[PDB]
Paper text:
Encapsulins are self-assembling protein nanocompartments capable of selectively encapsulating dedicated cargo proteins, including enzymes involved in iron storage, sulfur metabolism, and stress resistance. Encapsulation is mediated by specific cargo protein motifs known as targeting peptides (TPs), though the structural basis for encapsulation of the largest encapsulin cargo class, dye-decolorizing peroxidases (DyPs), is currently unknown. In this study, we report the structural and functional analysis of a DyP encapsulin system from a Gram-negative pathogen – Klebsiella pneumoniae (Kp). DyPs are ubiquitous, often homohexameric, heme-containing enzymes, named for their ability to oxidize and degrade a wide range of synthetic dyes – with concomitant reduction of hydrogen peroxide to water.
To investigate the influence of encapsulation on KpDyP and to compare the activities of encapsulated and free enzyme, a C-terminally His-tagged KpDyP construct (40.6 kDa) was heterologously expressed and purified. The structure of the free KpDyP hexamer was determined to 2.4 Å via D3 symmetry refinement followed by local refinement. The overall structure corroborates our biophysical and imaging analyses and confirms that free KpDyP exists as a catalytically competent hexamer. Cryo-EM density for a non-covalently bound heme cofactor – one per subunit – is clearly visible. The heme group is coordinated by residue His225, representing the proximal ligand to the heme iron. Arg242 is the residue closest to the heme iron on the distal face of the heme group. Moreover, the heme cofactor is substantially buried, with the entrance to the active site partially obstructed by an adjacent subunit at the two-fold interface. The KpDyP surface was found to be predominantly negatively charged, which is in agreement with its theoretical isoelectric point (pI) of 4.6552. The entrance to the active site is also highly negatively charged. In line with the predicted disordered state of the C-terminus, the last 60 residues – including the TP – are unresolved, which is generally observed for encapsulin cargo proteins in solution.
Author numbering: 3 to 315
Write the structure that this text describes.
């Protein structure tokens, strides 16, 4: 019974007000690998020591390793679907960006995420380099910077469990997960020029009430239509924790997309229906105002696997 990381629990609890998305690369050498392995061993204790004193702080961290990271830190028994994220070239472009380790810190307060990130980066020193750091907040009643409530159709409880955790199909890595992270930059002027009823056709739901539109009055290119895929005639779900971010003083207004799935082809199928179209050409108009700048795939091991990792200096 491998204990799994808090992948779906935080979302289902609904207490995250702040998040930090740290993407780093391991520097060349073996001391770097030893330091990373020591952090893998002590990460759960670090999270407990940072977040225990704060009642209702809801601190949690999720660590993920990419394909290159895995190759360099562990052996060759790679997980089944751990590979380099593939760039997409359709009506819109989805780039593939570097990154070896991913830390997804969430808490009901910013200082907990800040302190955990500081502790993680101080225990790593020069063994790593930072490729992406992003501080995200909750925008009003779970809305994104486009004004729509995001996360309504996320699976909950057992549904999220079967959506994210790997089963017997890869018996060695049962309890793990896969994640795909993308960073978007929005043009809110262009988005706000469009009327509300049209934006609601583009999304598929109502703006203020957050009610799904009836199937008759939604276009084929509705976002919640192109992201609704089926396997063997049954609906399949992924788990999303998209987070708004930005700085008004520099002009940055963006959304960090993070998607969890036991099978990463589901997320890639959604990404192909969006950037290329389903049918081709019939792409997603959110991409008209949203630009993707990063994209990476990570494998999320179990807590049991992480705690049993030895530095082997
Ligand atoms: C690779 C997949 C994927 C990407 C990328 C993605 C990118 C984005 N999304 Fe969005 N989104 C994806 C997959 C979904 C799903 C699976 C659903 C659920 C639809 C359903 O009916 O089951 C969804 N998105 C649904 C939504 C909804 C409304 C319903 C809900 O929250 O459940 C909103 C407002 C939304 N998104 C916004 C956005 C924005 C904004 C971006 C990027 C800028």
């Amino acid at each position: 019974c491998p204990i799994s990381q808090s992948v779906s629990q935080p979302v289902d609890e609904r207490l995250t007000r702040a998040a930090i998305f740290l993407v780093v690369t391991i520097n060349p050498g073996k001391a770097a690998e030893v330091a990373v392995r020591t952090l893998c061993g002590t990460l759960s204790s670090l999270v407990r020591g940072v977040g225990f004193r704060i009642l209702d702080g809801g601190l949690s961290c999720v660590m993920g390793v990419s394909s290159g990271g895995w190759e360099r830190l562990f052996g060759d028994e790679k997980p089944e679907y751990l590979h380099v994220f593939q760039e997409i070239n359709g009506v819109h472009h989805a780039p593939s960006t570097p990154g070896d380790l991913l830390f997804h810190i969430r808490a009901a307060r910013m200082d907990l995420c800040f302190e955990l990130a500081s502790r993680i980066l101080s225990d790593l020193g020069s063994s790593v380099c930072v490729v992406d750091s992003v501080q995200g907040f909750r925008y009003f009643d779970d809305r994104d910077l486009l004004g729509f409530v995001d996360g309504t159709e996320n699976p909950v409880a057992q549904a999220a469990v079967d959506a994210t955790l790997i089963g017997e199909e890869d018996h060695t890595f049962s309890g793990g997960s896969y994640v795909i992270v993308q960073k978007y930059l929005h043009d809110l002027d262009k988005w706000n020029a469009i009327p509300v009823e049209q934006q609601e056709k583009i999304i598929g739901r109502e703006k203020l009430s957050d009610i799904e539109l009836k199937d008759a009055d939604k276009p084929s290119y509705a976002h919640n239509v192109l992201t609704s895929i089926e396997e063997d005639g049954e609906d399949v779900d992924i788990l999303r924790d998209n987070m708004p971010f930005g700085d008004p003083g520099k002009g940055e207004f963006g959304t960090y997309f993070i998607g969890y799935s036991r099978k990463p082809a589901r997320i890639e199928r959604m990404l192909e229906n969006m950037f290329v179209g389903n049918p081709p050409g019939n792409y997603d108009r959110i991409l008209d105002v949203s630009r993707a700048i990063t994209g990476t795939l990570f494998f999320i091991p179990t807590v049991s696997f992480l705690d049993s990792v030895e530095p082997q200096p």
